[PDB]
Design an enzyme around this catalytic site. Structure first.
Site, mmCIF file in Angstrom:
data_model
loop_
_atom_site.group_PDB
_atom_site.id
_atom_site.type_symbol
_atom_site.label_atom_id
_atom_site.label_comp_id
_atom_site.label_asym_id
_atom_site.label_seq_id
_atom_site.Cartn_x
_atom_site.Cartn_y
_atom_site.Cartn_z
ATOM 1 N N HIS A 271 29.148 30.415 27.221
ATOM 2 C CA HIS A 271 28.967 29.837 28.998
ATOM 3 C C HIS A 271 29.341 28.310 28.803
ATOM 4 O O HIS A 271 29.753 28.011 30.323
ATOM 5 C CB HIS A 271 27.664 30.149 29.357
ATOM 6 C CG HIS A 271 26.373 29.511 28.342
ATOM 7 N ND1 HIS A 271 25.834 28.383 28.668
ATOM 8 C CD2 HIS A 271 25.752 30.109 27.447
ATOM 9 C CE1 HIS A 271 24.931 28.117 27.626
ATOM 10 N NE2 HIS A 271 24.953 29.326 27.181
ATOM 11 N N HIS B 93 26.834 19.077 27.988
ATOM 12 C CA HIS B 93 27.664 20.193 28.279
ATOM 13 C C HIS B 93 28.307 19.970 29.572
ATOM 14 O O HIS B 93 27.907 19.079 30.219
ATOM 15 C CB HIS B 93 27.103 21.339 27.968
ATOM 16 C CG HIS B 93 26.120 21.699 29.014
ATOM 17 N ND1 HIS B 93 24.868 21.159 28.760
ATOM 18 C CD2 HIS B 93 26.218 22.148 30.248
ATOM 19 C CE1 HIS B 93 23.904 21.449 29.954
ATOM 20 N NE2 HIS B 93 24.769 22.046 30.979
ATOM 21 N N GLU C 193 28.102 21.492 40.120
ATOM 22 C CA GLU C 193 26.853 22.406 40.356
ATOM 23 C C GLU C 193 26.419 21.838 41.650
ATOM 24 O O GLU C 193 26.302 22.268 42.669
ATOM 25 C CB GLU C 193 26.129 22.670 39.363
ATOM 26 C CG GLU C 193 26.966 23.317 38.049
ATOM 27 C CD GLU C 193 25.752 24.121 37.119
ATOM 28 O OE1 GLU C 193 25.017 23.386 36.298
ATOM 29 O OE2 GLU C 193 26.129 25.194 37.078
ATOM 30 N N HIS D 215 26.355 17.357 32.160
ATOM 31 C CA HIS D 215 25.027 17.341 31.876
ATOM 32 C C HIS D 215 24.652 16.893 30.560
ATOM 33 O O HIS D 215 24.791 17.477 29.633
ATOM 34 C CB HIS D 215 24.435 18.831 32.211
ATOM 35 C CG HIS D 215 24.433 19.311 33.747
ATOM 36 N ND1 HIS D 215 24.710 20.400 34.086
ATOM 37 C CD2 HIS D 215 24.732 18.549 34.857
ATOM 38 C CE1 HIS D 215 24.885 20.762 35.267
ATOM 39 N NE2 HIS D 215 24.730 19.446 35.789
ATOM 40 N N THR E 77 20.030 25.053 35.411
ATOM 41 C CA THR E 77 20.928 25.784 36.126
ATOM 42 C C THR E 77 21.635 27.176 35.504
ATOM 43 O O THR E 77 22.466 27.903 36.127
ATOM 44 C CB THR E 77 22.247 25.099 36.523
ATOM 45 O OG1 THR E 77 22.985 24.523 35.227
ATOM 46 C CG2 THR E 77 21.489 23.698 37.097
HETATM 47 N N1 LIG Z 1 22.757 23.583 32.914
HETATM 48 S S1 LIG Z 1 21.338 22.720 32.637
HETATM 49 O O1 LIG Z 1 20.321 22.575 33.821
HETATM 50 O O2 LIG Z 1 21.914 20.993 32.395
HETATM 51 C C1 LIG Z 1 20.385 23.173 31.048
HETATM 52 C C2 LIG Z 1 20.000 22.441 30.142
HETATM 53 C C3 LIG Z 1 19.538 23.128 29.030
HETATM 54 C C4 LIG Z 1 19.429 24.279 28.998
HETATM 55 C C5 LIG Z 1 20.211 24.980 29.757
HETATM 56 N N2 LIG Z 1 20.095 26.326 29.515
HETATM 57 C C6 LIG Z 1 20.323 27.040 28.218
HETATM 58 O O3 LIG Z 1 20.442 26.362 27.151
HETATM 59 N N3 LIG Z 1 20.050 28.513 28.237
HETATM 60 C C7 LIG Z 1 20.237 29.184 27.043
HETATM 61 C C8 LIG Z 1 21.681 30.006 26.827
HETATM 62 C C9 LIG Z 1 21.639 30.837 25.621
HETATM 63 C C10 LIG Z 1 22.968 30.622 24.643
HETATM 64 O O4 LIG Z 1 23.371 29.300 24.450
HETATM 65 C C11 LIG Z 1 20.545 24.622 31.038
HETATM 66 ZN ZN LIG Z 2 24.338 22.386 32.733
#
Ligand SMILES: NS(=O)(=O)c1cccc(NC(=O)NCCCCO)c1
Ligand SMILES: [Zn+2]
Ligand SMILES: NS(=O)(=O)c1cccc(NC(=O)NCCCCO)c1
Length: 257
Positions: free
Chosen positions: A61, A91, A103, A116, A195
């Site tokens: 993703h 990321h 976003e 982020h 998010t």
């Molecule tokens: N996009 S974000 O709000 O900065 C953020 C920060 C830390 C964790 C996440 N979400 C996840 O890691 N979801 C796990 C997805 C499983 C496969 O890696 C989103």
């Molecule tokens: Zn993010």
């Protein structure tokens, strides 16, 4: 599983993650004429001198750079935050076109991408505990605008060929995340959520006013990544962003006037 396509994207997530319709979901639109300047907000403290990057990886993703958070090396403090938050990973989210990809939005403006930098509150001992707390994570969000190249991003861009598909990773030691920041640390802040699923409502968002400039060639290389794993039908990793969610009973505060 979940994703960003028509059949598994943000409109579907609530069926498996009902907090998608919760009271403090992210991202949001930042209406600059409704955010309140708060002179009590402290300056941010970004202490990344001792950061230890480990790996870069395609998780299906986004792509993510991981860090050794087994001790207070790279930390975020100050601003709206109480205590010390350790850098775990960073990321990005980006678009298929330069006019979309971020976003958060600013006065409904979408940027080409959004960085982020994810930090967790050390008072909770480990990140799994932190994600269960309303103040467990702090995510520093940085907008990417298309213009001149960002020299501190080029090392990231040049290794993406080696992690084209989901599940691939590569060594990515000795990377300095300070090269990804803008000059100013002026910020907006509000309480929100992850998010992506599980969409946990555990994040203090700190979104920097100043975007960083990245070149068209740098963002093109993001768009060559794949959501799929090797040996599967190719699906370009683009438009991996959640749209803005209802602000509900929240106020966005600004550290600057
Ligand atoms: N996009 S974000 O709000 O900065 C953020 C920060 C830390 C964790 C996440 N979400 C996840 O890691 N979801 C796990 C997805 C499983 C496969 O890696 C989103
Ligand atoms: Zn993010
Ligand atoms: N995790 S989630 O966004 O709630 C979700 C909801 C409904 C379906 C999915 N995954 C799907 O595959 N949906 C469409 C089916 C294509 C089957 O090959 C994920």
């Amino acid at each position: 599983h979940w994703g960003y396509g028509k059949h598994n994207g943000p409109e579907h997530w609530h069926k498996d993650f009902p907090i998608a319709k919760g009271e403090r979901q992210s991202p949001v639109d930042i209406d600059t004429h409704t955010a309140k300047y708060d002179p009590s907000l402290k300056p941010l403290s970004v202490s990344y001198d001792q950061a230890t990057s480990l790996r870069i990886l395609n998780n299906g993703h986004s792509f993510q750079v991981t860090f050794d958070d087994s001790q207070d090396k790279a930390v975020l403090k100050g601003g709206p935050l109480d205590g010390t938050y350790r850098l775990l990973q960073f990321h990005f989210h980006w678009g298929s076109l330069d006019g979309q990809g971020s976003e958060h939005t600013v006065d409904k403006k979408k940027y080409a991408a959004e960085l982020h930098l994810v930090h967790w509150n050390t008072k909770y001992g480990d990140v799994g505990k932190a994600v269960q707390q309303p103040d467990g994570l702090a995510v520093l969000g940085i907008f990417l605008k298309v213009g001149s190249a960002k020299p501190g991003l080029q090392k990231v861009v040049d290794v993406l060929d080696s992690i084209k598909t989901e599940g691939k990773s590569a060594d990515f030691t000795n990377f300095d995340p300070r090269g990804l920041l803008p000059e100013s640390l002026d910020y907006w802040t509000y309480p929100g959520s992850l998010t992506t699923p599980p969409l946990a409502e555990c994040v203090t968002w700190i979104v920097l006013k100043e975007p960083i400039s990245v070149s068209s060639e740098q963002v093109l290389k993001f768009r060559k990544l794949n959501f799929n794993g090797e040996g599967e039908p190719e699906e370009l990793m683009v438009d991996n962003w959640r749209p803005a969610q209802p602000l509900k009973n929240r106020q966005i505060k600004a550290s600057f006037k």
